Design a binder for this molecule. Structure first.
Ligand SMILES: CCCCCCCCCCCO[C@@H]1O[C@H](CO)[C@@H](O[C@H]2O[C@H](CO)[C@@H](O)[C@H](O)[C@H]2O)[C@H](O)[C@H]1O
Lengths: 431, 57
């Protein structure tokens, strides 16, 4: 009823949900793509896929279990889902995969087949997923030569050069008890899980701490992947944002909610209380846009992504959007701040109070790894309601006004002006 | 110019038009006096003021 957190060597964290009809048990490691290098980039993604390999999944399915794995920038997860009663069967599989097995999943035929699978996977993403590919390039240029610049799926070049040894090296260096948290969500009790874990013994690399490196840094820059054969222009643009556990974490998320998301083809989306919408609908400057406040351990990105077929008016799209951002520093109104509060609460509620145990597992593990605990919506909502117009203006004057930007784009971006023209729009002339 | 010296007066903002114009007014006065003084001193003895000092009727 408040999320329990116990440690006996292995940190166990659970979140009991009485309305849930299933249960998820897994392990979340405090290491992701941000802990790789340009040459082993994609190793985590390769691990995810061998864990989700047919051999491993068939074994789990026979037991009535479903496997899930997510590779993020700061973390990595491996979850098993089952009925509330088969919760102990999940632990056995989990125990087996990360303690008993090794040479079973890393066999020549399984590794090569899995490698070939992720290779075609990544190739398709880079070849067809334009909005996400652009967002990945935003991170790449914004944090270039820094941990946060590496794509989570890895790069084709490094992927084709990866061997079983690379996987093992990463596992020995990151899949450690000191860098992990065993999570339990859905319909399960803490005692049931802690005792079932405390039932077994061993340690498997005890006291071993993960590798350390240099911190993430934001660099005003841009990467342009022009492709005149594509039907649209896809653009992502952002300034240095807030890291997780930043004092302005919510103020930044609220600022992003002010401008929000938009889908020109959805009737209700066109009626939102967003001033930018009055400027962009007259000549239909875009098909959609979405503002974000991405937060990581060392840094973050605040900005937006947009897609448009109006290739001759991209300059107006960017101009109007950045002119609106200017407003956060000098003229954002009370009702805009109040509307943002309500919608932010709804966003967080939908994110944290989702009816999915695997989602809760990922969120719970990631947070307890970073701050040792998980913040409740009750506390989050209180912080949000305390945000004032002066807080937004103070934050904007620091993060937005006359600040460097990172830009990424693909498709028909001839109309996207030079860096300086876009950068100049981060402020307004004053007397 | 030194970064910290600039920051104490304008922080991370460029100088505004109002201050530019105000500075131009001050510049005009100080610059004129400095140039005139250096110019007249450089030609000391040749100026009418200097000649009138000795010469009379
Ligand atoms: C025809 C002959 C007449 C010549 C007269 C010369 C004109 C001088 C104009 C001088 C300053 O005009 C001034 O320019 C600076 C940018 O340099 C503007 O600054 C604006 O952009 C800068 C740079 O991104 C921001 O730091 C700043 O916060 C913002 O207000 C300022 O608001 C404006 O007031």
């Amino acid at each position: 009823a408040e999320v329990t957190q116990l440690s006996n060597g292995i940190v166990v964290a659970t979140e009991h949900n009485p309305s849930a009809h299933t249960a998820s048990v897994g392990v979340v490691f405090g290491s992701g793509a941000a802990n790789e290098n340009p040459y082993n980039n994609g190793v985590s993604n390769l691990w995810k896929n061998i864990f989700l390999s047919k051999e491993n999944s068939a074994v789990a399915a026979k037991e009535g279990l479903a496997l899930s794995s997510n590779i993020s920038r700061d973390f990595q997860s491996y979850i098993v889902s089952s009925l509330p009663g088969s919760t102990d069967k999940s632990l056995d599989f989990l125990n087996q995969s990360f303690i008993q097995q090794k040479a079973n999943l890393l066999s020549s035929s399984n590794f090569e087949a899995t490698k070939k699978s992720v290779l075609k996977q990544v190739q398709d993403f880079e070849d067809n997923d334009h909005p996400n590919r652009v967002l990945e390039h935003l991170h790449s240029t914004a944090f270039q030569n820094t941990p946060l610049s590496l794509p989570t799926r890895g790069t084709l070049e490094s992927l084709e050069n990866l061997v079983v040894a690379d996987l093992e090296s990463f596992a020995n260096n990151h899949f450690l008890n000191s860098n992990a948290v065993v999570v339990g969500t859905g319909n399960i009790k803490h005692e049931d899980l802690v005792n079932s874990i405390e039932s077994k013994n061993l340690s498997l690399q005890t006291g071993t701490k993960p590798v350390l490196k240099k911190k993430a840094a934001f660099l005003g820059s841009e990467v342009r992947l022009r492709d005149d054969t594509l039907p649209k222009a896809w653009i992502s643009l952002a300034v240095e944002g807030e890291p997780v556990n930043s004092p302005n974490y919510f103020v930044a998320k609220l600022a992003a909610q002010i401008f929000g998301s938009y889908n020109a083809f959805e009737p209700a989306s066109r009626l939102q209380g967003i001033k930018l919408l009055d400027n962009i609908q007259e000549y239909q400057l875009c098909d959609n846009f979405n503002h974000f406040s991405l937060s990581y351990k060392d840094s973050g990105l605040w900005g937006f992504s947009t897609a448009t077929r109006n290739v001759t008016m991209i300059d107006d799209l960017i101009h109007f959007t950045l002119k609106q951002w200017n407003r956060l520093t000098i003229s954002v109104t009370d009702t805009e701040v109040e509307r943002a509060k309500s919608l932010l609460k709804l966003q967080l509620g939908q994110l944290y109070e989702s009816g999915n145990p695997v989602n809760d597992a990922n969120l719970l593990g990631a947070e307890v790894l970073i701050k040792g605990s998980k913040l409740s919506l009750g506390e989050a909502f209180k912080k949000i309601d305390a945000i004032t117009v002066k807080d937004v203006k103070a934050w904007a004057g620091k993060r937005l006004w006359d600040q460097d930007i990172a830009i990424a784009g693909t498709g028909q971006i001839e109309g996207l002006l030079d860096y300086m023209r876009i950068r100049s729009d981060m402020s307004m002339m004053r007397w | 110019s030194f970064s910290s010296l600039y920051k104490t007066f304008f922080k991370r903002n460029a100088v505004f038009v109002g201050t530019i114009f105000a500075g131009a007014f001050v510049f005009q006065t100080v610059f004129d006096t400095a140039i005139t003084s250096w110019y007249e001193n450089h030609n000391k003895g040749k100026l009418w003021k200097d000649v009138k000092a000795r010469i009379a009727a």
